[PDB]
């Protein structure tokens, strides 16, 4: 009949995010 128990632990850290977007296209090639 005493005081409330201690708060539970913090939840797990969320899942890792998705992979980042593809990088920008490379620069145009040199003229022949």
């Amino acid at each position: 009949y005493g005081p409330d128990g201690d708060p539970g632990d913090p939840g797990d850290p969320g899942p890792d995010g998705k992979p980042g977007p593809d990088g920008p296209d490379g620069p145009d090639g040199d003229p022949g």
Partner: protein
């Protein structure tokens, strides 16, 4: 004994995902 403690706080946001892959090759030069 007392009541059960409250639910623990929600976990923190996850870490950023893997860095993206390298981009596509450029626009082939004029011949």
């Amino acid at each position: 004994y007392g009541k059960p403690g409250p639910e623990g706080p929600e976990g923190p946001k996850g870490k950023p995902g893997p860095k993206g892959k390298p981009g596509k090759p450029g626009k082939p030069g004029k011949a």
